[PDB]
């Protein structure tokens, strides 16, 4: 019944990464806008367009990934009243390793709504 | 100072500048403030107008000549920001077919008199 409301773009991003590390599909999809034009690009992939595609992509990644840890560092932000873009480095430590793999870059775009913020786009890419 | 009435007009100008390797025309498409960033394939981001301009100068200066074809794959339209995701097909020299597609996210912001690019994020496709 209850759906979360994120008061700021930072809260949406915090929720996004928490859902990512927990591999929680319900929590993840609560961060995304209830709009069928959302889009999600995973590293080296073509975009997943609309809620069903985005949801299938997270489901597939969460289901196959096994256990990992995630640490994130912000690199830059472009802030407007209606949309906020946050560019971040994603550091994944996989399975039984204790130092992280090379950073993955991500552009995350948050859109304001009357009562809070939601994600409309995630574009991840590797760094040479 | 050129004004672009739609995000599509700004994109057309972006790609014409890109193919012509014209830094002056390219920078005419970007917002005239530091609220901008640009990520070239496999690169870390360039933040602010000066860095973005240095990036395009560096890309245009190193690239040599190429032909460009673009195909729109997705759009997210809102009142003050529009996001276009496109496949970019570069053909280098006498090569028959184009190289594998580069995927790009472009974000346009609405200003008082037109639209301007605030972000370009390009990545390779497996």
What CATH number did the domain enclosing A97 receive? 3.10.450.50
Give CA–CA dist B21/B61, Å, rounded.
8
End-to-end CA, chain A: 44
DSSP, res A79? E
DSSP, res B43? P
Q: Which two tokens stand for residue A91?
A: 């550091």
Can you tell me whether residue B69 is helix, strand or coil?
Answer: strand
Q: Which of A51, A78, A117 is the best substitution to test chain B (most B C-beta atoms within 10 A)? A: A78
Hey, which residues does A93 pair with through a beta bridge?
Answer: A69
Handedness of CA B38, B40, B44, B46 (dihedral sign): negative
Give CA–CA dist A110/A85, Å, rounded.
6
The resolution of the experimental structure, rounded to one decimal in Å, is 2.0
Residue with tokens 């399975």: A95
Query: Looking at the partner chain, which of B37, B73, B109 has a beta carbon nearest the beta carbon of A87?
Result: B37
Handedness of CA B71, B77, B80, B85 (dihedral sign): negative
- The count of domains in chain A is 1
- Asked whether A55 and A49 are in contact (CB, 8 A), the reply is no
Structural domain range at position A103? 2-128
Can you tell me whether residue B116 is helix, strand or coil?
Answer: strand
Question: Is B73's CB within 8 Å of A41's CB?
Answer: no
Handedness of CA B10, B16, B18, B24 (dihedral sign): negative
Return the closest-CA partner of residue A90 out of A74, A78, A76: A74
Chain A residue whose CA is closest to B42: A127
Can you tell me whether residue A43 is helix, strand or coil?
Answer: coil
- Asked whether A99 and B97 are in contact (CB, 8 A), the reply is no
Can you tell me whether residue B1 is helix, strand or coil?
Answer: coil
Residue B62 — φ and ψ, nearest 5°? -105, -25
- Asked whether B97 and B10 are in contact (CB, 8 A), the reply is no
Give CA–CA dist B4/B77, Å, rounded.
16
Chain A residue whose CA is closest to B111: A80
Residue with tokens 């599909």: A25
**What is the Cα Rg of chain A in Å?**
14
Neighbouring residues of B48: CB distance < 8 A, sequence distance ≥ 6: B34, B36, B37
DSSP, res B112? S
**What is the Cα Rg of chain B in Å?**
14
CA dist list (Å): B36 to A38, A61, A78, B117: 22, 31, 7, 8
Handedness of CA A69, A71, A77, A82 (dihedral sign): positive
Interface of A with B (CB under 8 A): 35, 37-39, 41, 43-47, 49, 75-76, 78-80, 82-83, 85, 87, 105, 107, 109, 111, 120-121, 123, 125-128
Q: Which two tokens stand for residue A6?
A: 């994120």
Give CA–CA dist A72/A91, Å, rounded.
6
Q: Which two tokens stand for residue A33?
A: 């806008």
Question: Is A82's CB within 8 Å of B85's CB?
Answer: no
């Amino acid at each position: 019944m209850s759906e979360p409301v994120f008061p700021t773009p930072e809260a949406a991003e915090d929720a996004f990464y928490a859902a990512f590390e927990a591999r929680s599909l319900d929590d993840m999809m609560a961060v995304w806008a209830r709009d069928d034009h959302v889009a999600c690009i995973h590293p080296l992939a073509a975009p997943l367009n609309g809620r069903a595609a985005v949801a299938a992509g997270w489901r597939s990644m969460f289901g196959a990934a096994g256990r990992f840890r995630l640490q994130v560092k912000a690199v830059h932000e472009i802030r407007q009243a209606d949309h906020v873009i946050r560019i971040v480095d994603e550091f994944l430590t996989i399975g039984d390793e204790t130092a992280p793999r090379p950073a993955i870059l991500a552009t995350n775009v948050y859109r304001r709504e009357a009562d809070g913020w939601r994600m409309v786009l995630h574009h991840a890419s590797p760094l040479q």
